[PDB]
Amino acid sequence: FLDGIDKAQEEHEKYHSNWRAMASDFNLPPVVAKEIVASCDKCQLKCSPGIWQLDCTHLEGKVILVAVHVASGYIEAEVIPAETGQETAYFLLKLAGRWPVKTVHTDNGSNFTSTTVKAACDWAGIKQEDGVIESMNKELKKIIGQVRDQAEHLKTAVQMAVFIHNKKRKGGIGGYSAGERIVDIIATDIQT
Amino acid sequence: FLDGIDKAQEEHEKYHSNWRAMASDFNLPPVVAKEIVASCDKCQLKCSPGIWQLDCTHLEGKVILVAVHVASGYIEAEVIPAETGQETAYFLLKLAGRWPVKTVHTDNGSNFTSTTVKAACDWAGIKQEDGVIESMNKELKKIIGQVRDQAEHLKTAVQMAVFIHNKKRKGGIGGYSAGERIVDIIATDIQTKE
Amino acid sequence: FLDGIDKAQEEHEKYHSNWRAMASDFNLPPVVAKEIVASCDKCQLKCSPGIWQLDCTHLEGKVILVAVHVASGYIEAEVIPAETGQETAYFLLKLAGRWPVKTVHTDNGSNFTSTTVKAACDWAGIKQEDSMNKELKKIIGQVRDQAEHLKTAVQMAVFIHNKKRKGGIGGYSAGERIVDIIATDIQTK
Amino acid sequence: FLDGIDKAQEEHEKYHSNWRAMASDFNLPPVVAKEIVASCDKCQLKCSPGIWQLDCTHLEGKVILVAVHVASGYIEAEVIPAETGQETAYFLLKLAGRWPVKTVHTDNGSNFTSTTVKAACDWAGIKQEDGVIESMNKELKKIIGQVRDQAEHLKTAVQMAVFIHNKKRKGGIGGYSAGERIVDIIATDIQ
Ligand SMILES: [K+]
Ligand SMILES: [K+]
Ligand SMILES: [K+]
Ligand SMILES: [K+]
Ligand SMILES: [Zn+2]
Ligand SMILES: [Zn+2]
Ligand SMILES: [Zn+2]
Ligand SMILES: [Zn+2]
Secondary structure (H helix, E strand, C coil), X not given: CCCHHHHXXXXXXXXXXXXXXXXXXXXXXXXXXXXHHHHCCCCCCCCCCCEEEXXXXXXXXXXXXXXXXCCXXXXXXXXXXXXXXXXXXXXXXXXXXXXXXXXXXXXXXXXXXXXXXXXXXXXXXXXXXXXHHHHHXXXXXXXXXXXXXXXXXXXXXXXXXXXXXXXXXXXXXXXXXXXXHHHHXXXXXXXX | CCCXXXXXXXXXXXXXXXXXXXXXXXXXXXXXXXXXXXXXXXXCXXXXXXXXXXXXXXXXXXXXXXXXXXXXXXXXXXXECCCXXXXXXXXXXXXXXXXXXXXXXXXXXHHHHCHHHHHHHHHCCCEEECCHHHHHHHHHHHHHHHHHHHCCCHHHHHHHHHHXXXXXXXXCCCCEEHHHHHHHHHHHHHHCCC | CXXXXXXXXXXXXXXXXXXXXXXXXXXXXXXXXXXXXXXXXXXXXXXXXXXXEEEEEEECCEEEEEEEECCCCCEXXXXXXXXXXXXXXXXXXXXXXXXXXXXXXXXXXHHHHCHHHHHHHHHHCCEXXXXXXXXXXXXXXHHHHHCCCHHHHHHHHXXXXXXXXXXXXXXXXXXXXXXXXXXXXXXXX | CCCHHXXXXXXXXXXXXXXXXXXXXXXXXXXXXXXXXXXXXXXXXXXXXXXXXEEEEEECCEEEEEEEECCCCEEXXXXXXXXXXXXXXXXXXXXXXXXXXXXXXXXXXXXXHCHHHHHHHHHHCCEEECCHHHHHHHHHHHHHHHHHHHCCCHHHXXXXXXXXXXXXXXXXXCCECHXXXXXXXXXXXXX
């Protein structure tokens, strides 16, 4: 924005760099960078920021509910006392209260297909369209693995793992964490 | 955007229009409009994004731990079994992996002073210290009352109240909800730091 | 209105949304939205549409009489010759025949308590009673070099303040709010 | 409003009641009653809201600048020291600052063709275009005439006349005053 728009346009004119590259290189907010790619004839832009995947995983005989913001890879997970629609519904309401949950992809099992979960979704305005999860499950279990001895109860280990996953594992063009990506993707979405 | 920055910038030299006005009047994303105001040397746009306030409030014989993002008004709350450091620590831990929590302000209750919470804060790199909290518990309790009927258990009502507060109560110059504001405050605090 | 009442009703049934929000979200006239709230047992509605605050301020050695529509924030102002009741009463007369002014709040200012003002108030059916100055001053400052006489700069600032400073749920200007507020009062009359 | 919207609609499918009738018979706000009419295939709910007519009239050797909001009949008037662009431009600025003035219609006087007035218009975003204002011009003088002895200076007499015209002369299907019509017209055009 210190002429970042013109510097970026010339750069794109010659090399046709994607928006992530231009956003990072010239310090432009994503909405601006994307518009440049939009204005180009020889290009095109590159999951809805409101799509989430939910599923349960098991460890130490305990149940863990996991939610994954597909577009960013941001995770939210909790050790729940029982694989019941009620516990899942409660978990959804909380999730829905902090993020713009629009549609949730889940399996057609007893729990996620329960009437309680459906009630929550209806209330929250979440449509259920019912391996991004197999990856998260195993990455989360690995982080829990590498940090398990720092906590007596799994609950805490799990929360430590979520913390590490969303804030201490960086990558990509901007070298962002998953936590910064969800916040960025959604702030950008608000911009349009 | 269709050379809108151009027109907006022109109109601004004359009227020195609000960012909300230029965004609306010229169909520009608010961040671009805000930049026009920042560029103008006759105007100026109008709390640290890492400051949160925690407190325990009571309703129907239950305990509700509430966390407020001071700069945004964004809330996060939960019914906990009892007012203990273990519950507080766990709550804090979940909060921290979710948002960039750097400083936390509390009332000094034994639960916030506990070694368990202190250990939680050290682990997650959070500094402890110590009207927003008070006023907020009131607004939440009020929404809880309006919604109580729709739920059997209070914990569900509490969560509906949080949802409503963060997403369905808008206002301010931007007409945003606290949920939309925190994402803006934090996303911005990232860019500047890049 | 395209079955917007129906949609707003269910939104409120769950989240008990305020009337401004429902008016804006479902494109319903304020009177319809406020009725949804009034019908609900869990809520209560939302300053009187006819209340105005009148004051004087100075700039460049001149007197600026400022009138503020408390509920909307809309403003009206003008450079007057002297801070005398006579000028104040004439200003009021002009205002009153423009907006439904029912009550005017002011200080004990000599020119605000003069008999000539009460005369004007009594004629127009206005009842006398009893920060915006700073905002006006500030806008005038951003626009000063665009005008010669202070008069014109003042009006330019009023224009700016009333039409180019949007905000709130509907992103309205003070100018749009006062009209909407008053039109809405006509609906419930 | 107490299910009155429902009743009103039922009756309309039968009588095709006027909006004033329904607003009155079912205690509904006029805007709700107008919608019912607009929603009916068999009925029709009967000038641009941004158009104003401007002109000067004389009385007692002084100049009165009058502005008319054509769609509502609403008025704004003032005694100006002289028929010059300088005075017209200041007047338009004040006006444009309170109402959404999009286009002004005037005669050909150098009074309104002045470059001073053109600068004022360009600044306020108003378009120019050199007998709706003749009727108001005469009725204003009439009201002034009957209220004159109530004020020492012409200045105050004129403002009393404007006040009376805008808020004390009702009519039309809605039984509204010009002051009420412009607001309704402007508020509706906003949405
Ligand atoms: K493209
Ligand atoms: K600035
Ligand atoms: K009520
Ligand atoms: K019709
Ligand atoms: Zn390209
Ligand atoms: Zn400016
Ligand atoms: Zn309600
Ligand atoms: Zn009909």
